[PDB]
Tab-separated table of C-alpha atoms and ligand atoms in Angstrom:
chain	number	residue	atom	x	y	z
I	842	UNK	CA	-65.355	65.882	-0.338
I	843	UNK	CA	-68.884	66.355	-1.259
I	844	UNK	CA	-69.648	68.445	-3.901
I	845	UNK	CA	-72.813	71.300	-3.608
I	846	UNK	CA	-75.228	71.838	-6.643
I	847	UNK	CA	-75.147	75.348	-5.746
I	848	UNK	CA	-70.975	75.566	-7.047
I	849	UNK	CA	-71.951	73.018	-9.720
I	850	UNK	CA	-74.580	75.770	-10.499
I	851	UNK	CA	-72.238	78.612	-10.329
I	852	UNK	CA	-69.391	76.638	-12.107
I	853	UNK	CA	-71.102	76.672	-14.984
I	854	UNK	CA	-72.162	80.646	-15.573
I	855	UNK	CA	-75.488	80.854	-14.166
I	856	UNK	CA	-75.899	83.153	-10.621
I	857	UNK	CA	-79.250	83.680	-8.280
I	858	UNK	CA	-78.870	87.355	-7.983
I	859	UNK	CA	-80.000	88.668	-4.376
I	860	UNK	CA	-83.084	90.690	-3.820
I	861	UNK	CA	-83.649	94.598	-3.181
I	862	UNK	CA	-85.721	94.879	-0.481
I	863	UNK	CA	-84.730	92.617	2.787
I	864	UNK	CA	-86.420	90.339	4.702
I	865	UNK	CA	-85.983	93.002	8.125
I	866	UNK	CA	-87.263	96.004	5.146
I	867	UNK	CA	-90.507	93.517	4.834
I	868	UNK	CA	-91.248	92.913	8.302
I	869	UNK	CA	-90.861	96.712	8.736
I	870	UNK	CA	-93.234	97.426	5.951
I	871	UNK	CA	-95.805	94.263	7.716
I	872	UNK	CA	-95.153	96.320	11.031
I	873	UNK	CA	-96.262	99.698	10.024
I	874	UNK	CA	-99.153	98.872	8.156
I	875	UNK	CA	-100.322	96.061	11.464
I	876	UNK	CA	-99.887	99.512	13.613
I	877	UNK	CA	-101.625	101.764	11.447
I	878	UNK	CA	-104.320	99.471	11.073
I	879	UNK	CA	-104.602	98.213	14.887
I	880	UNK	CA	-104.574	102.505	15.412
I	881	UNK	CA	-106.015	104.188	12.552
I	882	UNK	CA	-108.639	101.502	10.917
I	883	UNK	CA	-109.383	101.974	7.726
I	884	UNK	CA	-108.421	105.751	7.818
I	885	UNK	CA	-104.626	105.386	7.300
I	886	UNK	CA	-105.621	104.200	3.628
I	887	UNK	CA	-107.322	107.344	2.634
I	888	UNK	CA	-104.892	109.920	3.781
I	889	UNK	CA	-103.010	110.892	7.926
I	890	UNK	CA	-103.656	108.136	10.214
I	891	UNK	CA	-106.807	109.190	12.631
I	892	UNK	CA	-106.747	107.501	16.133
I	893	UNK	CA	-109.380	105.541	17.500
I	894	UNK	CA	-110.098	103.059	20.044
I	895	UNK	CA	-110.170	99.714	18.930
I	896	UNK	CA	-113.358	98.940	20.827
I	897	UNK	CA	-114.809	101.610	18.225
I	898	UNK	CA	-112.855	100.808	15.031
I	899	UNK	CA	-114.174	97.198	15.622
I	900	UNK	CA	-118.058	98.488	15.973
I	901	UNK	CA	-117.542	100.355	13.104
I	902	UNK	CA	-116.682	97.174	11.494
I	903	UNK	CA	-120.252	95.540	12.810
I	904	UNK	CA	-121.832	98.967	11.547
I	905	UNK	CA	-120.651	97.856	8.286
I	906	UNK	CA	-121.134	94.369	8.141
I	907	UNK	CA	-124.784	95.309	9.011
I	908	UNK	CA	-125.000	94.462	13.101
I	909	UNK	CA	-126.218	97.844	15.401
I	910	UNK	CA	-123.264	98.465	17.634
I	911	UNK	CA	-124.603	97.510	21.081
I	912	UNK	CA	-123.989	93.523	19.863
I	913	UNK	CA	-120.290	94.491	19.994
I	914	UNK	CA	-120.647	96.710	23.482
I	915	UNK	CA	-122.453	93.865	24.901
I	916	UNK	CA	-120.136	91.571	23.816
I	917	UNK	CA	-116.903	92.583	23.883
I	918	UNK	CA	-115.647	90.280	26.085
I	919	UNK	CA	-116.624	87.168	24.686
I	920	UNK	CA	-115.746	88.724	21.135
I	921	UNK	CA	-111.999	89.050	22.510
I	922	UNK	CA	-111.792	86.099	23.770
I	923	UNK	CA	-113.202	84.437	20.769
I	924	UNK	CA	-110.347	86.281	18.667
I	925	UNK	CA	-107.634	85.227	21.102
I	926	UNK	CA	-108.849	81.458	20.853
I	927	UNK	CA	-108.433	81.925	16.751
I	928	UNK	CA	-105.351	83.477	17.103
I	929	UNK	CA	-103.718	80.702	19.337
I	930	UNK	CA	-105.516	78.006	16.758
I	931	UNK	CA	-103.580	79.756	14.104
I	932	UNK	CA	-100.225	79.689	16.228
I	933	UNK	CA	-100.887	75.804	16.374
I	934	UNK	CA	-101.741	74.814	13.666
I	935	UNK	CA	-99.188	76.580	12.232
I	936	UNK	CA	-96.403	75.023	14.698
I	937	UNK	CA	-97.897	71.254	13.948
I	938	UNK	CA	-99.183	71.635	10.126
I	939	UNK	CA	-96.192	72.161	7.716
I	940	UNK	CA	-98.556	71.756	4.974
H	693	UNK	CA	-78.933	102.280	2.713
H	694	UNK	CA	-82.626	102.993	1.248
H	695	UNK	CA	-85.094	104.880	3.103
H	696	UNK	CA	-88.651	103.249	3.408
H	697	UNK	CA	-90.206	106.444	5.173
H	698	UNK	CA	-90.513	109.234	7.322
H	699	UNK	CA	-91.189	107.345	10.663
H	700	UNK	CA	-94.387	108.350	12.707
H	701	UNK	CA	-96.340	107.259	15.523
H	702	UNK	CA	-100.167	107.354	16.027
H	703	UNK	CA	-100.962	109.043	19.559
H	704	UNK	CA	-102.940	106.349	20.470
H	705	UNK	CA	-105.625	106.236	23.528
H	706	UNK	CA	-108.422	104.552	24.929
H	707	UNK	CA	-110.891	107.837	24.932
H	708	UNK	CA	-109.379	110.216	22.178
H	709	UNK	CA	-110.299	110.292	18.691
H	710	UNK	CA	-108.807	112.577	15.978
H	711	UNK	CA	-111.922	114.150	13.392
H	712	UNK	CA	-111.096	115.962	10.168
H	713	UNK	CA	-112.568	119.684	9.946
H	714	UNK	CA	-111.759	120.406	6.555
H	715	UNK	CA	-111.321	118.468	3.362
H	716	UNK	CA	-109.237	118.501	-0.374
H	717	UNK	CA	-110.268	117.455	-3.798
H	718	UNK	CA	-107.428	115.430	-5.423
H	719	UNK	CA	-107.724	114.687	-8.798
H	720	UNK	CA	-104.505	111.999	-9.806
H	721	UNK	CA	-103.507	110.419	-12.905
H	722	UNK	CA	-103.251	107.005	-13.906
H	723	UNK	CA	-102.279	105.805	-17.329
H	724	UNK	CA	-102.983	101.954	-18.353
H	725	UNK	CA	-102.146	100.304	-22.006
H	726	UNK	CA	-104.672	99.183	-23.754
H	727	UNK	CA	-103.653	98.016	-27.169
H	728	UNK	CA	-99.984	97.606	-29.315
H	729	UNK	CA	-98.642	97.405	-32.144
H	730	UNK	CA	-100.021	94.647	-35.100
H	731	UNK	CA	-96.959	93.552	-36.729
H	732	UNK	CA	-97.323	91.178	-39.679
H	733	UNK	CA	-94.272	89.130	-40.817
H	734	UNK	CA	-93.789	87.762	-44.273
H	735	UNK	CA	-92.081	84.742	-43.139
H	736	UNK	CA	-91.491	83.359	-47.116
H	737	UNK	CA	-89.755	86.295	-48.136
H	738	UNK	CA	-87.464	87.321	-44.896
H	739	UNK	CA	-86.177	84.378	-44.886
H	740	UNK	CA	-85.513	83.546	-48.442
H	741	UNK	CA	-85.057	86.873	-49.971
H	742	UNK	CA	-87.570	86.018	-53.018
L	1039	UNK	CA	-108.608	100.794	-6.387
L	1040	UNK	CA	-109.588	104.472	-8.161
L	1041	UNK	CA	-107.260	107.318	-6.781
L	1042	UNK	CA	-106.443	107.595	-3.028
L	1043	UNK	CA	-108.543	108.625	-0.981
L	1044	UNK	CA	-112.690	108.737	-1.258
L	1045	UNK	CA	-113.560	107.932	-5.006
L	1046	UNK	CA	-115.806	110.756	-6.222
L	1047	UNK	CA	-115.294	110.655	-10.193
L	1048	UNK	CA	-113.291	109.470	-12.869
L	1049	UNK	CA	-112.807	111.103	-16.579
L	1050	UNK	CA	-111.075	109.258	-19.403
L	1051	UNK	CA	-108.833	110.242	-21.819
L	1052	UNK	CA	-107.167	109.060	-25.302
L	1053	UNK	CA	-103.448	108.185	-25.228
L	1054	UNK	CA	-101.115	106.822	-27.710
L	1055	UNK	CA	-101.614	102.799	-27.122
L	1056	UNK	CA	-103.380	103.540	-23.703
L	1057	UNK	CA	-105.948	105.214	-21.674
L	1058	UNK	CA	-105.341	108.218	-19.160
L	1059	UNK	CA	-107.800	108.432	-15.909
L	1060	UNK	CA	-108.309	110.599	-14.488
L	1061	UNK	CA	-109.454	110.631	-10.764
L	1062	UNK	CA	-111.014	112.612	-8.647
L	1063	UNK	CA	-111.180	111.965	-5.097
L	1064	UNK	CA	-111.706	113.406	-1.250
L	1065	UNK	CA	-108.908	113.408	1.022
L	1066	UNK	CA	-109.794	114.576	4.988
L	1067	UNK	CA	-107.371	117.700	5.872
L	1068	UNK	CA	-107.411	119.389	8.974
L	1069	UNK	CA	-107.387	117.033	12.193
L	1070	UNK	CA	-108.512	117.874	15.451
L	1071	UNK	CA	-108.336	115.623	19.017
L	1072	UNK	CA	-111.083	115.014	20.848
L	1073	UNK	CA	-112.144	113.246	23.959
L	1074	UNK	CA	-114.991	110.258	22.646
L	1075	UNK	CA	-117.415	107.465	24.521
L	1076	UNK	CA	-119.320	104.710	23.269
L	1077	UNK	CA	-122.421	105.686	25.319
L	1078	UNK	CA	-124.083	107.813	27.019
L	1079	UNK	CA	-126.281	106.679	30.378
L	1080	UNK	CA	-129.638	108.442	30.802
L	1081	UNK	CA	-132.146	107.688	33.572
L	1082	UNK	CA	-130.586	103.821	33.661
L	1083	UNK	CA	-130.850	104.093	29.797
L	1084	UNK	CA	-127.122	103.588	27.443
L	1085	UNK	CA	-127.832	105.931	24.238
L	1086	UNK	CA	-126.063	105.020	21.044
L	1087	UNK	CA	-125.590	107.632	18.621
L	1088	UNK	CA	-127.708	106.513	15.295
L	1089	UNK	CA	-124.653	107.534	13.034
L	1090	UNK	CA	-121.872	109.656	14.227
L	1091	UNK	CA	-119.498	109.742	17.105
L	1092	UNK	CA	-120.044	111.060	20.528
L	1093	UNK	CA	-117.489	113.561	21.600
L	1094	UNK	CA	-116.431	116.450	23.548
L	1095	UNK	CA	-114.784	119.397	23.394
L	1096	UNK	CA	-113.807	119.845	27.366
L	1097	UNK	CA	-117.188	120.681	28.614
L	1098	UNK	CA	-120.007	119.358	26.875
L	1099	UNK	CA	-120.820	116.122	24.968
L	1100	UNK	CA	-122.089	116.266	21.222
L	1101	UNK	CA	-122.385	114.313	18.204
L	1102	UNK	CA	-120.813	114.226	14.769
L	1103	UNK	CA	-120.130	112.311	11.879
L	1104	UNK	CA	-117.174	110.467	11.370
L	1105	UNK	CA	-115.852	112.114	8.111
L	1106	UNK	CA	-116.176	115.670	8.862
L	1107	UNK	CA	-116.631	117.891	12.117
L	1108	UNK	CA	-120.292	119.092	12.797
L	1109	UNK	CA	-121.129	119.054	16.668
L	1110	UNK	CA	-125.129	118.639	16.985
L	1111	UNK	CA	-126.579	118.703	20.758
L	1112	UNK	CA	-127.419	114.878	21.306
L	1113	UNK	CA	-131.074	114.721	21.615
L	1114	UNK	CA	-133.385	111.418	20.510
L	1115	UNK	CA	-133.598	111.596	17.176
L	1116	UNK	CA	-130.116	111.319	16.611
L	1117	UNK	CA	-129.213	108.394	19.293
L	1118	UNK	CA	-130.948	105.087	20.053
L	1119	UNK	CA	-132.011	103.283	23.734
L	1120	UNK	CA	-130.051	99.542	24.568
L	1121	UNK	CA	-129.947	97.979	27.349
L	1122	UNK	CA	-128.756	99.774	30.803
L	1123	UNK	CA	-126.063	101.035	32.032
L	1124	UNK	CA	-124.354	98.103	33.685
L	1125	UNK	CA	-122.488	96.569	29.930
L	1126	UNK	CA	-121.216	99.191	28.292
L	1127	UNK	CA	-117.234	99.763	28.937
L	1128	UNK	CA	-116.379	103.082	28.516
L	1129	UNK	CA	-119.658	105.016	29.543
L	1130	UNK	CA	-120.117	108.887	30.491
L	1131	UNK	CA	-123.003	110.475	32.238
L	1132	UNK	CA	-124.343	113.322	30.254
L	1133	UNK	CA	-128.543	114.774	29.945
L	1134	UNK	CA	-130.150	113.556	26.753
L	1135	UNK	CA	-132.481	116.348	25.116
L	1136	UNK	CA	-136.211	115.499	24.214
L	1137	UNK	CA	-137.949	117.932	21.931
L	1138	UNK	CA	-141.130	116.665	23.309
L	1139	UNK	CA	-140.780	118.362	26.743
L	1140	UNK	CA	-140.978	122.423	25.402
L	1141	UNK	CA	-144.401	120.612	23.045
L	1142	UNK	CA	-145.644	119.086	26.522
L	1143	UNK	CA	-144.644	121.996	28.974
L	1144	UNK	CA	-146.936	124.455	26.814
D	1	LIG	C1	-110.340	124.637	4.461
D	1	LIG	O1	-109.265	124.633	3.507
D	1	LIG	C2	-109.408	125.589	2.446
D	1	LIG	C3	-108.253	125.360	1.500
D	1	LIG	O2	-107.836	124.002	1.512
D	1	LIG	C4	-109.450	127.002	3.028
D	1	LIG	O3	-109.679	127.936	1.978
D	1	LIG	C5	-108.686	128.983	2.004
D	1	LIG	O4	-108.901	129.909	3.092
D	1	LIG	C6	-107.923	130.959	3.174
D	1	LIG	C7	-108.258	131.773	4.401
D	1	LIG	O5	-107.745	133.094	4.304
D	1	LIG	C8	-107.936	131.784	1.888
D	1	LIG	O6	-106.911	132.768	1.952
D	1	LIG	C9	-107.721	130.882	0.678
D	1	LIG	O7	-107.856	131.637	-0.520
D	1	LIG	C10	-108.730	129.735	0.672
D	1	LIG	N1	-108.476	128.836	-0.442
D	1	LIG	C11	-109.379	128.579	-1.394
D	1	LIG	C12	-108.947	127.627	-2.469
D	1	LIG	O8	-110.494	129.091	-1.389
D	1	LIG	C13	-110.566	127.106	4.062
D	1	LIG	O9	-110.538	128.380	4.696
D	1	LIG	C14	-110.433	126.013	5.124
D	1	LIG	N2	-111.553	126.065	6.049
D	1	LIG	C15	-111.403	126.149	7.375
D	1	LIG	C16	-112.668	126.192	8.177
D	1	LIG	O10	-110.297	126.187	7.902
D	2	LIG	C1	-117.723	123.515	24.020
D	2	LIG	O1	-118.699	123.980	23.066
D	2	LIG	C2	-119.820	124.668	23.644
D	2	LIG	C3	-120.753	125.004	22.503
D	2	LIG	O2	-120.159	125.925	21.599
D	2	LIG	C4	-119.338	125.897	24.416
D	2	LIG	O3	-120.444	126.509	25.072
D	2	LIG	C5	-120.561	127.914	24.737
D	2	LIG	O4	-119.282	128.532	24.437
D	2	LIG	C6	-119.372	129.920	24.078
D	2	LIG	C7	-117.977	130.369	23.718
D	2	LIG	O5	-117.734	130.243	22.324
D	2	LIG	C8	-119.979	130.714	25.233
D	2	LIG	O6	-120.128	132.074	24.841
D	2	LIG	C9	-121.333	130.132	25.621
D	2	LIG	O7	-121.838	130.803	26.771
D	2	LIG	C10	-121.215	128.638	25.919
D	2	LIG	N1	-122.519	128.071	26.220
D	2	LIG	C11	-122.718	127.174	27.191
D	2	LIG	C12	-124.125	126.693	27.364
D	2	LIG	O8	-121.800	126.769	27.898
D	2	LIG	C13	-118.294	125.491	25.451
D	2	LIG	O9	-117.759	126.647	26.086
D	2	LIG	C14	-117.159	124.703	24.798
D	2	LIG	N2	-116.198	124.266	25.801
D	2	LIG	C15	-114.880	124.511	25.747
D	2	LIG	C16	-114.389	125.291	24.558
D	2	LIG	O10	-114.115	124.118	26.622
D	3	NAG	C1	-103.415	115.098	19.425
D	3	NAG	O1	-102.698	114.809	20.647
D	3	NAG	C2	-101.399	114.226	20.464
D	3	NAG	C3	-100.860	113.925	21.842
D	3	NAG	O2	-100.852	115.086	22.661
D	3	NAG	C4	-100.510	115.181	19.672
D	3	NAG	O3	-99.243	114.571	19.455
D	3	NAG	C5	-101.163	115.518	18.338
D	3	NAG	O4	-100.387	116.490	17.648
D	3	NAG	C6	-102.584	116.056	18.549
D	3	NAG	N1	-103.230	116.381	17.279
D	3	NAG	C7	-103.546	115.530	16.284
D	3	NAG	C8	-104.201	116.154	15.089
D	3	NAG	O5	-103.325	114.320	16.336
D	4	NAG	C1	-107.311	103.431	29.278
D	4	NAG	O1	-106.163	102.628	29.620
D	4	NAG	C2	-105.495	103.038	30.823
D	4	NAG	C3	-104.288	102.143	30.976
D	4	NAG	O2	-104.071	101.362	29.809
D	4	NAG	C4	-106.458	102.953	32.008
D	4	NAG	O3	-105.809	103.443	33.175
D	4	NAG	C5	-107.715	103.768	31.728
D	4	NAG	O4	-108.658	103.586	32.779
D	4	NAG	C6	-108.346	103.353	30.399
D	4	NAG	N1	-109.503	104.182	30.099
D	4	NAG	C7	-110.751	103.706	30.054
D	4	NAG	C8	-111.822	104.702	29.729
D	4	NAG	O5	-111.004	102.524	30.265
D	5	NAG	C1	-123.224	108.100	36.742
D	5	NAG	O1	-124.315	108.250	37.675
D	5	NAG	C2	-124.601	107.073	38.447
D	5	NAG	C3	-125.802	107.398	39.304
D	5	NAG	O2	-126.050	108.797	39.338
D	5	NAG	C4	-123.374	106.676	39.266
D	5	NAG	O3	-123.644	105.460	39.953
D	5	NAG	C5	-122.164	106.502	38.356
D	5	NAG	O4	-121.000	106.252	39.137
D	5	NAG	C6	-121.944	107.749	37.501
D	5	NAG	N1	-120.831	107.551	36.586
D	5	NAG	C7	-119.911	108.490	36.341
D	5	NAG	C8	-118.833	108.115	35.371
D	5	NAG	O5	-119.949	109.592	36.878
């Protein structure tokens, strides 16, 4: 009884034409560069992915920023937690903010 | 169906690390525009024919 | 952002409405495994390595750099003293060398 805007739109010759690559395609791509990072650092980038722990990847991410590495293996605890308090502020304000 | 890649999966672990011993030189190739053509349109003439 | 991999050089070159770059690069090869620590505890001490990575080949503990394999014997020069050995998750117990001792032992 109603009529849409989308058949009023495709009543009259013009058509949204799908797109190649698929959400699922996306997340894939999102998925294998998160677990190449999260294993490799930055050395996935630059050629075959190189393991490392993340405890080192992320010191030699304070070696870079220009903090000596023992501020990381001193506080790797609190730095964890720290990122898993951001990570859940993200999550909600995410969920409440739809701004 | 397209193929996005070969799949592969990092051996990950707490106390192993993988080191390169040996190296390669790539030299690639990458071609930008810079500049096109300067068309100039006598707009009197093509549209009146003199 | 120039070629992928390590950006060692670029060359230009003319092209018909366009430029051609060319770039040269270093790309890491041959991988090897090895078994790494963060630190090493010495006499109560936790040695950092000044720039490299701590590993080991089985038996013995050296020190590299990250980019390319070259096992040194982890002495002093090469590793800095932090703190003890009660913080650090993750550490071995391995001998640190001091080139002082053969100098003093004379
Ligand atoms: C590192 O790789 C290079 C090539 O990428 C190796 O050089 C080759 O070595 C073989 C060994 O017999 C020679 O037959 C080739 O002629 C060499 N190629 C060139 C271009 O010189 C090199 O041996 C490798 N190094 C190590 C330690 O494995
Ligand atoms: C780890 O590397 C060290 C240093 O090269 C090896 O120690 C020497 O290995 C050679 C064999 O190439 C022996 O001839 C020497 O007697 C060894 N010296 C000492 C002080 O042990 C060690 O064997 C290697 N461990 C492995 C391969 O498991
Ligand atoms: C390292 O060890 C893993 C697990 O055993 C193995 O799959 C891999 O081929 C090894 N070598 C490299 C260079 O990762
Ligand atoms: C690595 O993780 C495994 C389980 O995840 C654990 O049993 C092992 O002790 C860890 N290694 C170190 C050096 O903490
Ligand atoms: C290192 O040595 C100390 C004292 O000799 C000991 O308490 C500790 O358990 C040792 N750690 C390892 C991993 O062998």
């Amino acid at each position: 009884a109603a009529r849409d805007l989308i058949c009023a739109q495709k009543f009259n010759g013009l058509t949204v034409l799908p797109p190649l690559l698929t959400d699922e395609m996306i997340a894939q791509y999102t998925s294998a560069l998160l677990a190449g990072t999260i294993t490799s650092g930055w050395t996935f980038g630059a050629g075959a992915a190189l393991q490392i722990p993340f405890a080192m990847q992320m010191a030699y991410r304070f070696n870079g920023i220009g903090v000596t590495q023992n501020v990381l293996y001193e506080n790797q605890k609190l730095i964890a937690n720290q990122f898993n308090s951001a990570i859940g502020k993200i999550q909600d304000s995410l969920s409440s903010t739809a701004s | 169906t397209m193929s996005l890649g070969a799949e592969n999966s990092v051996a990950y672990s707490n106390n192993s690390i993988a080191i390169p011993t040996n190296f390669t030189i790539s030299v690639t190739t990458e071609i930008l525009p810079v500049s096109m053509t300067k068309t100039s349109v006598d707009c009197t003439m093509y549209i009146c024919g003199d | 952002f120039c070629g992928k991999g390590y950006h060692l050089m670029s060359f230009p070159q003319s092209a018909p409405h366009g430029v051609v770059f060319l770039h040269v690069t270093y790309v890491p090869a041959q991988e090897k495994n090895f078994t790494t620590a963060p630190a090493i505890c010495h006499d109560g001490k936790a040695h950092f390595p000044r720039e490299g990575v701590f590993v080991s080949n089985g038996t013995h503990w050296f020190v590299t750099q990250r980019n390319f394999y070259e096992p040194q014997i982890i002495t002093t020069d090469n590793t800095f003293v932090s703190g003890n050995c009660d913080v650090v998750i993750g550490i071995v117990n391995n001998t640190v060398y001091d080139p002082l001792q053969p100098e003093l032992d004379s």
